Design a protein around this ligand. Structure first.
Ligand SMILES: N[C@@H](CCSC[C@H]1O[C@@H](n2cnc3c(=O)[nH]cnc32)[C@H](O)[C@@H]1O)C(=O)O
Ligand SMILES: [Zn+2]
Length: 404
């Protein structure tokens, strides 16, 4: 298949050019320049690498807007947890289908999850078409984790590697919901399977523990996606530079729950790898990485308008995200995955045409035209080709009634 005859943004550091792309068996076979015979003419649009959301809680789409005007502790222990006790396996599946519908209309190809009923979440990702690094949220009480780590291993056993689209990791919630001993066990497990770890790190100001207790139990050796890092002491930026440590920046969530602004510019200048996550729909409340990217840039610019320039931003949502997720995506080059998104250039916000890249970061709403994952269209002109929209919608309607 060859799509094109339009502008093509190869990667974050290059400029658009008129051409086309040939996809074959979920990969990029070749990138053509100039005019050429295409099977799909996307003239008047832009083709670029798809985006990768490095942090979310998929089924929380079912709780969108249910927890407003609350401090962090109230939000989680008073509002969210009681509702989650009522969230079923079936709801996890449909909440994830909904989450993918939303992420897909925003050009997202893959996401990193941390939740429960994870196998049902995996089924939903299987059916929808996206890529995902799935992990089970882990917490313990003096070593007793209620069988959560075991569930994570079951998930690993049954889903790691599925169709090259799904990978399984471990999700210890945070250094405060996980005891020191339990955390070491989780890191040792991940270390043994050579699997990633995702954890909420220094999300709130109350967290003042030393990163040393983690740096010497596996962090230096385990690929880790640390969400938030709002209060990560700057004295550690140096050491985090050369280990597979990926910060997942979640600007909207940090602001909405009154946690603050992470010094991303500083982290980046110190050589740290930084990616973008949306977190869950109950504390965002959208699953839009374009919005997240724009917001991130603005927040850093408040300190210095030169902070988080356009290319650095595009790199963060595309290539860096794919890297944290272990997928060879993020660039339209031969041999790379065919994970692409199509943006409509025939819009007010995309003018002047000579500044398209800037528009992508500071003016575009995030509503893409189509999104392709593994060579398949998972969203196209308002349509969801991989699912029965109407059926899914009815189920969600029943779930809303049942859940609330
Ligand atoms: N509560 C789960 C274990 C953690 S799953 C991942 C958890 O992260 C929670 N979560 C969602 N958003 C945030 C956030 O912004 N900060 C901290 N935790 C969050 C989410 O509600 C979920 O409970 C259980 O009992 O098995
Ligand atoms: Zn989170």
């Amino acid at each position: 298949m060859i799509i094109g005859n339009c502008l093509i943004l190869k990667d974050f550091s290059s400029e658009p050019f008129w051409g086309a792309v040939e996809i074959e068996n979920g990969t990029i076979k070749r990138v053509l320049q100039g005019e050429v015979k295409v099977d799909l003419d996307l003239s008047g649009k832009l083709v670029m690498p798809a985006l990768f959301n490095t942090h979310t809680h998929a089924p929380m789409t079912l709780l969108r807007g249910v927890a407003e005007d609350l401090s962090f502790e109230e939000w989680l222990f008073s509002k969210v947890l009681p509702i989650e006790d009522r969230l079923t396996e079936k709801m996890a599946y449909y909440g994830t289908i909904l989450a993918q519908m939303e992420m897909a209309r925003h050009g997202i190809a893959g996401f990193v999850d941390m939740y429960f009923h994870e196998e049902w979440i995996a089924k939903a990702v299987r059916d929808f078409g996206m890529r995902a690094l799935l992990t089970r949220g882990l917490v313990d009480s003096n070593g007793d984790d209620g069988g959560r780590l075991e569930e994570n291993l079951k998930l690993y056993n049954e889903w790691n590697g599925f169709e090259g689209r799904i990978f399984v990791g471990f999700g210890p919630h945070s250094p405060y919901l996980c005891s020191e001993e339990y955390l070491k066990r989780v890191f040792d497990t991940a270390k043994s399977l050579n699997a990633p770890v995702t954890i909420h790190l220094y999300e709130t100001s109350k967290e003042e523990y030393d990163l040393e207790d983690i740096l010497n139990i596996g962090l230096k050796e385990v690929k880790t996606i640390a969400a938030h890092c709002v209060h990560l002491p700057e004295r550690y930026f140096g050491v985090l530079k050369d280990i597979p440590f990926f910060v997942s920046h979640n600007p909207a969530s940090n602001l909405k729950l009154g946690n603050g602004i992470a010094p991303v510019q500083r982290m980046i200048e110190h050589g740290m790898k930084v990616t973008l996550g949306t977190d869950g729909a109950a504390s965002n409340n959208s699953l839009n990485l374009f919005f997240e990217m724009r917001l991130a840039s603005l927040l850093q610019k408040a300190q210095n308008p030169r902070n988080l320039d356009v290319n650095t931003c595009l790199k963060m949502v595309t290539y860096d995200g794919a890297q944290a997720m272990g997928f060879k995506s993020g660039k339209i080059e031969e041999g790379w995955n065919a994970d692409l998104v199509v943006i409509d250039l025939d819009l007010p916000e995309m003018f002047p045409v000579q500044n398209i890249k800037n528009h992508l970061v500071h003016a575009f709403s995030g509503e893409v035209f189509a999104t392709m994952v593994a060579g398949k269209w998972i969203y196209f002109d308002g349509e969801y080709p991989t699912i029965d929209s109407e059926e899914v919608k009815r189920e969600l309607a029943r779930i809303e009634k049942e859940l609330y």
